[PDB]
């Protein structure tokens, strides 16, 4: 199963890991993607997960958008996890760099509650521009299901654990 995670709460665990490498090792039921509303997986977690699927995630995502239109900020959709997981839960956290409402971060984390266990990144962190300390706080106060957080940056991982209340 998952190994080397530090327990933060009853249901939230954290590890300094590349989520792509974690997904290929564990092959979880659900891997969360830090998606945008158009499912255009260019950079950050989305670009790395899509690259690991040899672009199959992008092709499937384009068909989903052609059929359904864009997601909402705070929303999600379940698609295939390809070679990384059984499913990929594409969740859209607010992108602060695009001036989106940070209050939608709690709504984005609520999508995790529909899945018993997930491998996930910190929503709205990284290139999405939100404070990762705040994202971890919203995660532990919103998600009730088992979430295994993979934090790519070692220095940020150390800061998140050492500042966790």
From Swiss-Prot:
Changing residue 29 to A: In strain: Mu/B.1.621. Inhibited in vitro by GRL-0617. Residues 1-165 form the Macro domain. Responsible for the cleavages located at the N-terminus of the replicase polyprotein. Participates together with nsp4 in the assembly of virally-induced cytoplasmic double-membrane vesicles necessary for viral replication. Antagonizes innate immune induction of type I interferon by blocking the phosphorylation, dimerization and subsequent nuclear translocation of host IRF3. Also prevents host NF-kappa-B signaling. In addition, PL-PRO possesses a deubiquitinating/deISGylating activity and processes both 'Lys-48'- and 'Lys-63'-linked polyubiquitin chains from cellular substrates. It is found in: Host endoplasmic reticulum membrane. May form homohexamers. Interacts with N protein. This is Papain-like protease nsp3. It catalyses: Thiol-dependent hydrolysis of ester, thioester, amide, peptide and isopeptide bonds formed by the C-terminal Gly of ubiquitin (a 76-residue protein attached to proteins as an intracellular targeting signal). It comes from Severe acute respiratory syndrome coronavirus 2. It is a multi-pass membrane protein. The gene is rep. The lineage of its organism: Viruses, Riboviria, Orthornavirae, Pisuviricota, Pisoniviricetes. It comes from the Viruses.
